[PDB]
Amino acid sequence: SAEWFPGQPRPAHLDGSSPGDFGFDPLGLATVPANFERFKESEIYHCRWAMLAVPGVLLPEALGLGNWVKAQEWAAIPGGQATYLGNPVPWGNLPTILAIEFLAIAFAEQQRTMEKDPEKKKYPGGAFDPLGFSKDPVKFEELKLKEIKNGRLAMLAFVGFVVQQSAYPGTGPLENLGSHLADPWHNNIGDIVIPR
Amino acid sequence: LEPSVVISLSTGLSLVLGRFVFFNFQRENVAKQVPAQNGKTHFDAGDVRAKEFAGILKSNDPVGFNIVDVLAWGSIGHIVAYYILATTSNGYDP
Amino acid sequence: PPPIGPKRGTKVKILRRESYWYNGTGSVVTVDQDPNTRYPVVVRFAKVNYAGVSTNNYALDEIKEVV
Amino acid sequence: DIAGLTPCKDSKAFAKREKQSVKKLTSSLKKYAPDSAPALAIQATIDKTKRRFENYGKFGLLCGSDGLPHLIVSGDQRHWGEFITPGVLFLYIAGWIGWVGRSYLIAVSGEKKPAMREIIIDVELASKIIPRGFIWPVAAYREWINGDLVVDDADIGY
Amino acid sequence: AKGAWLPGLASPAYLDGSLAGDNGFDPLALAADPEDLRWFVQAELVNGRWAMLGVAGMLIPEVLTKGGLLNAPEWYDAGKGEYFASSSTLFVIEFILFHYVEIRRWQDIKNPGSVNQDPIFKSYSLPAHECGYPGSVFNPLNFAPTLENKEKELANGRLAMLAFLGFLVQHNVTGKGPFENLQQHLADPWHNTIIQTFS
Ligand code: CLA
Ligand code: CLA
Numbered sequence: 279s280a281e282w283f284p285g286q287p288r289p290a291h292l293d294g295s296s297p298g299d300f301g302f303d304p305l306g307l308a309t310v311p312a313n314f315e316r317f318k319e320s321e322i323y324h325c326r327w328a329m330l331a332v333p334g335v336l337l338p339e340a341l342g343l344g345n346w347v348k349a350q351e352w353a354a355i356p357g358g359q360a361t362y363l364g365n366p367v368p369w370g371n372l373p374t375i376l377a378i379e380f381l382a383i384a385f386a387e388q389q390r391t392m393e394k395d396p397e398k399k400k401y402p403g404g405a406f407d408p409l410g411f412s413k414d415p416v417k418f419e420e421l422k423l424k425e426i427k428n429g430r431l432a433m434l435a436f437v438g439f440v441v442q443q444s445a446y447p448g449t450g451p452l453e454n455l456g457s458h459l460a461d462p463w464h465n466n467i468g469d470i471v472i473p474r
Numbered sequence: 475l476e477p478s479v480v481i482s483l484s485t486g487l488s489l490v491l492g493r494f495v496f497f498n499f500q501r502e503n504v505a506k507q508v509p510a511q512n513g514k515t516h517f518d519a520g521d522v523r524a525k526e527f528a529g530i531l532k533s534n535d536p537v538g539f540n541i542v543d544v545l546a547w548g549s550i551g552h553i554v555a556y557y558i559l560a561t562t563s564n565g566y567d568p
Numbered sequence: 569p570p571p572i573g574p575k576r577g578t579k580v581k582i583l584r585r586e587s588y589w590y591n592g593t594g595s596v597v598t599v600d601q602d603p604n605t606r607y608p609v610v611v612r613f614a615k616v617n618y619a620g621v622s623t624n625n626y627a628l629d630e631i632k633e634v635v
Numbered sequence: 636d637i638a639g640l641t642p643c644k645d646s647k648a649f650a651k652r653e654k655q656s657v658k659k660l661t662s663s664l665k666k667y668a669p670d671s672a673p674a675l676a677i678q679a680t681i682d683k684t685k686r687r688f689e690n691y692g693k694f695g696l697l698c699g700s701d702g703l704p705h706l707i708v709s710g711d712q713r714h715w716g717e718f719i720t721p722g723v724l725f726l727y728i729a730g731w732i733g734w735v736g737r738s739y740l741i742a743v744s745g746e747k748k749p750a751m752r753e754i755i756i757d758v759e760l761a762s763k764i765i766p767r768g769f770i771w772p773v774a775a776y777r778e779w780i781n782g783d784l785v786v787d788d789a790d791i792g793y
Numbered sequence: 794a795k796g797a798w799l800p801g802l803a804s805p806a807y808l809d810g811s812l813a814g815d816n817g818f819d820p821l822a823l824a825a826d827p828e829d830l831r832w833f834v835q836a837e838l839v840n841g842r843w844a845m846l847g848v849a850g851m852l853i854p855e856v857l858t859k860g861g862l863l864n865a866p867e868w869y870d871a872g873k874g875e876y877f878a879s880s881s882t883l884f885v886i887e888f889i890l891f892h893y894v895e896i897r898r899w900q901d902i903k904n905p906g907s908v909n910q911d912p913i914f915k916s917y918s919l920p921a922h923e924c925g926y927p928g929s930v931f932n933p934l935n936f937a938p939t940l941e942n943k944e945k946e947l948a949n950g951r952l953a954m955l956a957f958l959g960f961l962v963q964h965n966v967t968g969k970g971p972f973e974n975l976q977q978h979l980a981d982p983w984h985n986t987i988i989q990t991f992s
């Protein structure tokens with residue numbers, strides 16, 4: 279049966295030996311295998327960026343440098359100059375930041391999609407696995423599962439960050455945790471869910 | 475701030491993007507998009523003014539870069555250059 | 569020689585596009601056994617058409633037997 | 636208040652309209668004997684008018700610059716008595732009527748000449764189906780769940 | 794045994810008497826379809842047990858306080874009191890705790906025996922039973938699920954549902970609680986009825 283919903287039948291196109299398949303596909307968006315492979319790749323790509331982004335949202339706020347939202351305010355000021363760890367960035371000019379980012383990232387992401395092997399498309403080797411951990415396929419698959427799980431848990435956390443930011447303008451992630459710890463029985467989602 | 479530098483830099487970056495970054499995608503999507511009417515191209519159907527010009531399309535560049543491509547990416551270069559050159563004195567525009 | 573067509577009393581479904589009872593059902597009355605008859609199946613219906621008729625003739629490939 | 640409107644219990648134009656109507660009625664009342672029937676009818680009309688204005692005032696309606704009540708239908712919880720609750724009543728009654736009609740048509744279609752039962756009603760049968768509209772929202776929902784409400788497109792034909 | 798709610802009336806054909814509490818009562822033909830019958834059989838037990846619990850916990854505190862051993866508000870005012878947590882927190886806790894148990898109950902109605910397994914400790918499950926009447930942990934003293942006891946449960950539940958409806962309606966006209974209404978009826982039986990309430 280379906281692992282995500284105990285007592286529920288598995289989908290016809292699912293139940294295969296996939297890294298993270300729990301039989302969850304209510305809308306049946308994965309009927310065509312050619313769409314399914316690219317959905318797997320897209321899932322891996324969203325997971326990795328979210329996992330890499332979570333510390334980048336939690337660390338500067340915890341170091342007293344401004345939450346992840348206020349760090350983008352200097353770009354909206356005409357004379358705004360970038361700062362990093364309190365050290366002003368000499369090249370903090372907005373046009374060059376918007377230019378070199380596009381110019382470099384376009385090439386860096388154009389290179390990766392010229393690959394034609396679907397299995398190697400999700401997981402390349404070479405200069406991306408320096409220490410090397412594919413020596414044992416069983417532990418390789420185990421690590422793949424333990425990676426996709428943390429990636430889904432990280433995407434959930436980022437969406438939570440966005441929604442909690444929208445609920446309390448001007449605040450940060452860890453500030454909400456501190457407020458919750460201050461008054462557990464009075465500071466919860468109940469006020470927003472049931473508004474006064 | 476200096477137009478004679480901004481325009482040159484923008485044109486150079488646009489030409490680099492055209493020749494080395496998005497060349498394959500453009501040249502492979504172009505092959506699949508040929509206008510036709512009732513299963514035949516415009517020149518095959520009878521239009522004598524729809525012949526594709528041959529002199530201007532050939533080039534000795536290793537990848538086939540030509541004059542039409544030069545103009546296509548140079549136009550982007552000038553447009554972006556004058557976009558940056560306008561929202562500097564005072565421009566609140568998208 | 570085997571008798572052609574469905575037996576009397578069979579329920580059939582109409583496939584002729586320009587017929588009033590298209591996609592409806594009717595009852596077989598009789599089948600003409602002459603090999604030269606082009607439309608040999610006689611069908612009767614509960615509802616009359618715009619001309620007030622409630623029976624019509626059809627070919628063997630214009631009717632489907634529904635069980 | 637809402638949309639620049641004023642409560643009718645605090646509107647000067649509303650009170651002016653009430654006074655004008657009462658004066659117009661009293662002018663006619665002053666033409667007949669005090670104990671005659673027309674005088675009593677006019678007095679009853681005057682009392683009814685005063686009651687109507689008082690009830691409109693104390694039921695929380697809003698009045699415009701013209702001095703007439705206006706209705707709010709955007710969903711605001713201070714005005715559900717204006718559209719939402721009567722709307723629920725209208726839907727309940729209409730569903731009852733439609734449900735009993737459909738059930739009669741389905742129950743009668745199994746006969747030899749169903750049309751004869753459409754110009755001459757079988758009251759004995761209808762009197763057993765009429766009380767069942769009392770729970771039409773449950774019956775219709777369960778019928779929808781089990782696939783008995785709708786006919787497939789392939790089966791539709793004369 | 795199978796009685797009659799109206800002496801002199803014929804019973805429906807689909808109420809042959811295979812269910813506890815059968816008395817041939819379905820004038821409006823809600824349960825003609827077999828599946829509707831199962832759905833309503835479950836719903837009756839659930840609404841009835843909730844009504845029994847509500848009536849007990851809605852009436853006992855009132856008489857306890859009126860006796861003089863406690864000081865608690867009426868049932869229609871307890872939601873406007875001072876508690877260690879706000880009402881919103883309690884509602885959210887209730888919603889989260891109930892989504893899980895109610896979908897767990899739903900999965901067993903959809904197909905019996907599907908959710909008998911313990912999710913965490915993979916060593917406990919529910920032996921075969923009938924929907925609406927589980928056992929094991931839910932029957933600590935391990936009583937006997939005889940036909941007599943099921944009828945005794947159903948009768949009290951059906952009584953409790955009407956009692957709760959009566960409380961709800963009597964609060965919206967009098968506004969003094971159940972026990973005060975009963976003592977008022979017992980003071981002057983011929984001058985304190987529903988007729989005097991509206992006039
Ligand atoms: C964008 C990220 C992303 C993508 C592309 C995929 C893709 C895939 N997932 Mg994964 N997944 C994700 C995020 C993603 N997942 C997250 C965040 C979780 C945790 C909740 C999971 C949990 C999960 C499980 C448990 C399983 C999968 C599976 C699958 C596969 C089948 C389903 C499908 O066709 O999805 C295609 C998806 C899309 C085309 C995206 C549609 C988005 C719509 C248009 C809007 C959604 C808005 C959102 C609901 C708003 C509220 C968010 C809030 C609740 C956080 C497929 C390879 C199944 C599998 O077999 O994997 C191998 C499987 O068992 N995923
Ligand atoms: C059993 C009664 C019944 C029912 C359930 C429906 C249902 C429907 N009709 Mg139909 N209709 C009926 C009778 C009925 N109609 C009659 C008698 C007429 C002749 C005037 C029409 C003329 C009619 C039109 C012209 C249209 C519909 C449409 C519709 C649809 C949308 C609702 C609507 O616009 O209603 C509006 C219908 C009316 C206001 C007509 C009056 C309905 C009466 C009050 C019904 C009950 C009368 C009956 C004698 C009661 C018998 C009781 C029984 C116990 C003996 C819906 C499928 C619309 C549609 O196609 O939507 C997609 C549409 O355009 N109906």
Ligand code: CLA
Nearest residue numbers: 955956958959962963966967974975977978985986987990
């Ligand atoms: C079933 C339990 C039950 C019982 C024992 C009572 C008892 C009482 N009710 Mg209440 N009542 C009930 C149900 C009940 N009610 C229900 C279901 C409703 C909603 C229609 C009401 C609505 C209601 C109002 C509006 C009023 C009362 C009032 C009263 C009191 C005066 C008698 C009277 O006028 O009754 C009126 C009776 C009805 C309106 C209908 C009663 C219908 C029930 C189901 C009949 C039960 C029959 C059953 C065989 C009796 C068993 C008795 C005993 C063994 C439990 C009295 C203490 C009055 C009061 O407060 O006086 C101070 C009053 O004003 N009741």
Ligand SMILES: CC1=C(/C=C/C(C)=C/C=C/C(C)=C/C=C/C=C(C)/C=C/C=C(C)/C=C/[C@@]23O[C@]2(C)C[C@@H](O)CC3(C)C)C(C)(C)C[C@H](O)C1
Nearest residue numbers: 819820821822823840843844847850851868871954957958
């Ligand atoms: C059977 C049948 C029919 C009849 C059907 C009928 C009459 C059905 C009637 C159903 C009724 C009245 C159901 C009532 C259910 C009531 C329930 C579940 C009540 C629950 C109450 C609870 C939890 C109370 C909680 C609290 O009080 C406490 C504990 C403490 C307080 O501080 C707080 C609150 C919240 C107030 C016909 C339709 C007539 C024909 C058909 O053919 C056959």
Ligand SMILES: CC1=C(/C=C/C(C)=C/C=C/C(C)=C/C=C/C=C(C)/C=C/C=C(C)/C=C/C2=C(C)CCCC2(C)C)C(C)(C)CCC1
Nearest residue numbers: 485486489544545546547548549550551552553554556557
């Ligand atoms: C590398 C190499 C080389 C070189 C090359 C070059 C150097 C090139 C250049 C090129 C270029 C340099 C180009 C350009 C182009 C341009 C263009 C194409 C432009 C356009 C423009 C426009 C269209 C404009 C418009 C306008 C106006 C008119 C007004 C105002 C506004 C605007 C700006 C919009 C050779 C040969 C030796 C060979 C070997 C290698």
Ligand SMILES: CCCCCCCCCCCCO[C@H]1O[C@H](CO)[C@@H](O[C@H]2O[C@H](CO)[C@@H](O)[C@H](O)[C@H]2O)[C@H](O)[C@H]1O
Nearest residue numbers: 389390392393394395398399401402403404405406407
């Ligand atoms: C925050 C950002 C930090 C960035 C740090 C710098 C990262 C630099 C990464 C450069 C990767 C360059 O890639 C280099 O190794 C890849 C893996 O062997 C090669 O890729 C090749 O080998 C792959 C693995 O066997 C196969 O899919 C193909 O044969 C082919 O794609 C590239 O042809 C080579 O150019």
Ligand SMILES: CCCCCCCCCCCCO[C@H]1O[C@H](CO)[C@@H](O[C@H]2O[C@H](CO)[C@@H](O)[C@H](O)[C@H]2O)[C@H](O)[C@H]1O
Nearest residue numbers: 775776777778779780781782783784785786787788790
């Ligand atoms: C705020 C409100 C939110 C509501 C959310 C819940 C919505 C629930 C929708 C239930 C839809 C039930 O009806 C839906 O499935 C039925 C089958 O089960 C379909 O029924 C169809 O298939 C059945 C077999 O399965 C056939 O016996 C029926 O003749 C055929 O019509 C209905 O044509 C369709 O409309």
